């Protein structure tokens, strides 16, 4: 049973037996990395055709909006898969968590078989509040050289998120759930985070609710990785921020292979989180891994165990043993190309 | 001078601050040291829920001082750090912490030498928060041109003093576009029509944290806001082994406070006689070098250098099945023979 | 018809046939110009049985709370009427608001008839928010020399005052009704009144809204109250606070003939202004008649129309008329004494 | 010999009531030329040119009320020139029925800062914050400038109005900082406290108990009404705004008369006065004295008053009662 909070409205299109599904390619090494995925999920047999739209953003009223074409798109199908874009007034990534009212950013950093990194055996689970806390445009400039940046913390959108990884949490089958935070000196805005977890604590008797400080959090993570991997461990927006940037950094040393999904209540975008990469762009050098494994993150969300347990169980995750095959971020001597077709083999 | 450090014929009159945790035990590893050394100062001692007010008082006469961490409740009837009490109420505004690490210690990733400078008195550590209606709560954070002027300076004079080339600001200025913008202007700004020798730059906080856990060795001394400082510390205090191998210091422009640059309370294993004292020693060698003293501490520090480089014999956790009070009369026998 | 937002719910006490109502006599000349409001009420046959308790507080906690005695009884009988009280650590009206859940002070001010004051024709009605506003205890030190008073305002605190003051309007055929404000520079707080006002207007087409700064409002009540008698103006916190001693400035002079009522969602308390006149008290020179309207305003409030205008239209409001008559603070000579049967006369 | 005065007509009556003045001036042959500017973010013309000019002579703009509205900019002004201070004079005159007589207050307000430093938000919907600041620089500088204004033309009085009982920190500082620096400065002055609503009954019951009332930005426009209407309305008041290095002379009332525009009705009293405040300053003053005894003298003798004051006479028709008994004095 997938996490009740984000639930996928199925419903494969009548006519076709698939599901409907926005793709987004973007701009860089996007493209390339997009057809690779296009061509893995072809060949697996997905009950899932393609329907790619534009985010390139317009300007109603000053304010950034994004365009009817892509809105209409993806709050029709209730799910999309957007690569990298570029820095096109209101950031890109921002109007389009507020007009698809995506709320939680699911962060994973698992270790990669077969690509030698300083940490090991880190399987990392990440929630992070992407509404408010820190990242609310509130500011003032209280007089001349005084200036007050406001975080803003509500239980209403706390609930929420804390709500997502115990079910996200008893989806993947972790038991243990730790809420970071600093009540230590935050004690109201990250303590009604808190309480907001042990009021719900008691709705999830299955998962146990562990209380920790980022001081540890961050502590304890990099001495001990693994100290996690029955994780998942929620926390407000500026926290979520730097932890899951941070758990990236040593489960692979940079976030090429880092993957996220964006969970809104009947809506939720899957991205990978690394750039445009401009420069490698058209060279066939780029590595769909990361993209690829927001795929997986979107077929379960979906429903599509099945699917999913094959295209990451199988396929990429193993076919990233062999420097014949791998790319050039990973030691790797293969193209975007040939980690396509090399992957879909053991598909 | 009124305004120096409490000192007697020859003799300095620091305070001392056991406080929370293995914080008493950790403290007394340093008194013997210290008597074993026969170093010319005299411990004022005090203890402890709001006589936060004895250890100002106290650190207002003798300037200098040395201490444990106190404990902090996080339920919402509890008291307050009063680690930050004492800070704000004497203006120790800079926070000081020294990862570097050490020989004889097992760590993923090895010869590294960087520093976490933190504005101890405002940003998210201002503690000024209300809520307008149930269940919706603000958290107001203060950056002032004033405070952060300050840290700047005291950051680059510091690494002009200790001959650090580079100095990197941590901020979320694309986020937070006034508050943290204005620490980033004021940190770069400074650094290079004053301070034209160093190296100013900045560097987001997330992804900072992603450097420092990934490839650490590109960074040299990074100047913070209050939280960002607990954050990148902790990440440097795993990077060397743990928090017990950290020194610290705090400033202010009259007072000197010199604590565990780690800052962990270790409530757990109090009484145990397990814990790790190099933290607080290392700390202590910086309080030494600062009222002077020095040859004493380029002394003491040697011996417990050298002590955990010289494998067993040292404490639990560093890899060895010593005690503290163990690892310290090593430390002194080291020493008796220098 | 009463206002349906603060609606007494009357069951008179079977073994009676009276109503219960808690007096709360107060220090001061209060225990004297209670007694005066004790007779009255005998004579006019009110089905009206007075339960006297006491407010003196507690202080379960360091904050101040109100005794149990009196909550129990408070909150019973859903009315209260308390005379003056004198200023024994938060304060006692404040607290005495928390925890009846009182939100909105009505204030009328209109000329006495044989009472000459400078100002004439002066026929004022106010509601007051009494909640939130400038009036929230949120303020903070954000530096050395650096303070901020936080003015909090909130739609549904809005809603509910705007509601009863059209509500109120109606309740005594006023036509107009009229939001004070300053949305010129608190573009979002005193807009969101005003908003909240503008969209309840709809729901209330007998009455017309009017919206105006404080700036005319207090401009234009001065050069001439009257312009107003067809009034009930509503606003914030400060702004109400403000004009209604103001409005009583012009009306009397003074406040010493003023009545409020506090209105909450189910208890209602009705008081008198003035202060404990403790140099006054027991020498029989008090002046009832403040306390005696808010009698007045209470029967109303609770539906005895028939024995409000009886107490008010005829008695106090007509007895108030001939020197030998009135109090010393009228220029009359007549002690509370003689005023209390001077009045049941004309009862 | 020249002066070059700033000419700011704004909104409303605004037009018709300054040409009054430049008649008056020229029929005076006042040595000063207007440099005047017309204006939806020119506001920054008004304040670059009052920056070569140092001093300017204006009406009101109008403010919006609706949300996508831009904003005082009569405050920007202010602000932007740091002109911290507003006197207004509320001085009953001769030729006027007023409900109480022979009054004659002061009112200096802080014009940057307290409930006009327009800083708010929304939090969640439906719960907006406007925080009101108040900073001990600010307040010790228009504490100062009123106590010496205070000095200056003999006033024996000085009130402090505020609301400290509710708001401890805020009108707290604002009152303390006030009487503290009126205390061990300026000891020759009767220093007090007043709390703003029990002032406002005050103001409209017994005004003659009151001087001079320093008070934050928003007290200052509910006294200054009260004060306002209590001598006859607000084109009978003259004000000025003062800071460091300009000042800027406008009507002590502060209202735009929008509804009568172009009609030829209003009453230039005001802008005149406040005119004359101008001429004080820049040191004129013989032409000061003059042409308002003969606005004065004007208004005293009944009929050609303006339509306010209980006359019949279009703003026209009473300029030119001044110029002419100014042309025989
Ligand atoms: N003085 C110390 N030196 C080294 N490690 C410590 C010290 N205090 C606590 N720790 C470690 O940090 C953990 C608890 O940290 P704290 O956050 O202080 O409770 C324990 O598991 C200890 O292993
Ligand atoms: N020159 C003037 N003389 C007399 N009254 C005026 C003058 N200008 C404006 N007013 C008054 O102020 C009001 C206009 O200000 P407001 O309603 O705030 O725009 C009108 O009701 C007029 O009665």
């Known amino acids: 049973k997938q996490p009740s909070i984000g639930r996928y409205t199925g419903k494969p299109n009548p006519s076709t037996g698939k599901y409907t599904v926005s793709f987004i390619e973007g701009d860089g090494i996007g493209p390339e990395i997009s057809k690779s995925v296009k061509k893995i999920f072809s060949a697996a047999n997905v009950p899932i055709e393609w329907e790619s739209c534009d985010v390139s953003p317009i300007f109603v009223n000053g304010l950034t909006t994004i365009p009817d074409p892509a809105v209409q798109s993806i709050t029709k199908n209730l799910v999309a898969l957007k690569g990298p874009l570029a820095t096109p007034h209101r950031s890109l990534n921002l109007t389009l968590r507020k007009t698809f009212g995506l709320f939680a950013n699911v962060r994973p950093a698992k270790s990669i078989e077969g690509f030698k990194t300083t940490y090991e055996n880190v399987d990392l689970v990440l929630i992070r509040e992407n509404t408010e806390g820190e990242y609310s445009g509130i500011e003032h400039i209280v007089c001349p050289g005084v200036v007050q940046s406001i975080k803003l913390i509500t239980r209403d959108a706390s609930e929420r998120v804390i709500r997502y990884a115990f079910e996200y949490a008893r989806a993947i089958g972790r038991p243990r759930v730790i809420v970071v935070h600093k009540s230590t000196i935050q004690r109201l805005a990250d303590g009604l985070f808190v309480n907001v977890a042990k009021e719900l604590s008691k709705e999830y008797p299955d998962l146990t609710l562990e209380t920790e400080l980022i001081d540890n959090s961050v502590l304890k993570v990099v001495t001990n990785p693994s100290a996690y991997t029955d994780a998942v461990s929620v926390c407000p927006n500026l926290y979520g921020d730097i932890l899951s940037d941070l758990n990236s950094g040593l489960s692979a040393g940079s976030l090429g292979l880092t993957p996220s999904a964006n969970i809104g209540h009947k809506i939720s975008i899957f991205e990978a989180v690394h750039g445009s990469a401009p420069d490698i762009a058209g060279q066939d050098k780029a590595n769909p891994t990361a993209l690829l494994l927001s795929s997986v993150m979107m077929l379960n969300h979906m429903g599509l165990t099945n699917h999913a347990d094959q295209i990451q169980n199988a396929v990429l995750s193993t076919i990233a043993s062999g420097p014949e095959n791998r790319t050039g971020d990973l030691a790797g001597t293969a193209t975007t190309s040939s980690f396509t077709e090399a992957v879909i083999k053991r598909l | ?338």
Chains 1, 3 share one sequence.
């Open chain 2, 1 to 338: 001078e009124r305004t120096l450090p409490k000192k007697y014929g020859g003799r300095f009159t620091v305070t001392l601050i056991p406080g929370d945790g293995v914080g008493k035990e950790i403290t007394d590893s340093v008194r013997t040291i210290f008597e074993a050394e026969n170093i010319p100062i005299d411990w004022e001692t005090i203890n402890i829920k709001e006589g936060v007010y004895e250890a100002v008082e106290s650190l207002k006469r003798n300037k200098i001082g040395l201490k444990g961490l106190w404990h902090t409740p996080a339920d919402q009837t509890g008291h307050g750090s009063l680690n930050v009490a004492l800070r704000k109420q004497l203006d120790i505004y800079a926070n000081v912490a020294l990862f570097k690490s050490l020989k004889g210690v097992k760590t993923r990733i090895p010869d590294i030498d960087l520093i976490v400078i933190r504005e101890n008195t405002e940003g998210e550590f201002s503690g000024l928060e209300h809520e307008s209606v149930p269940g919706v709560v603000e958290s107001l954070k203060v950056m002032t041109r004033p405070k952060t002027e300050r840290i700047a300076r005291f950051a680059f004079d510091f690494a002009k003093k200790y001959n650090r080339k580079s100095v990197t600001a941590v901020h979320k200025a694309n986020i937070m576009k006034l508050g943290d913008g204005l620490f980033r202007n004021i940190i770069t700004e400074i650094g290079q029509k004053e301070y034209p020798d160093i190296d100013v730059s900045s560097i987001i906080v997330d992804n900072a944290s992603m450097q420092a856990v990934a490839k650490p060795h590109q960074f040299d001394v990074l100047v913070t806001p209050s939280m960002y400082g607990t954050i990148l510390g902790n990440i440097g205090a795993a990077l060397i082994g743990g928090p017990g191998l950290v020194a610290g210091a705090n400033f202010g422009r009259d007072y000197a406070v010199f604590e565990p640059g780690s800052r962990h309370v270790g409530l757990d294993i109090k009484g145990q006689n397990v814990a790790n004292p190099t933290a607080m020693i290392l700390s202590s060698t910086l309080m030494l070098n600062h009222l002077g003293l020095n040859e004493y501490a380029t002394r003491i520090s040697k011996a417990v250098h050298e002590t955990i480089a010289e494998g067993k014999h040292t404490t639990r956790d560093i890899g060895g099945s010593s005690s503290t009070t163990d690892f310290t009369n090593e430390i002194i026998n080291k020493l008796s023979t220098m």
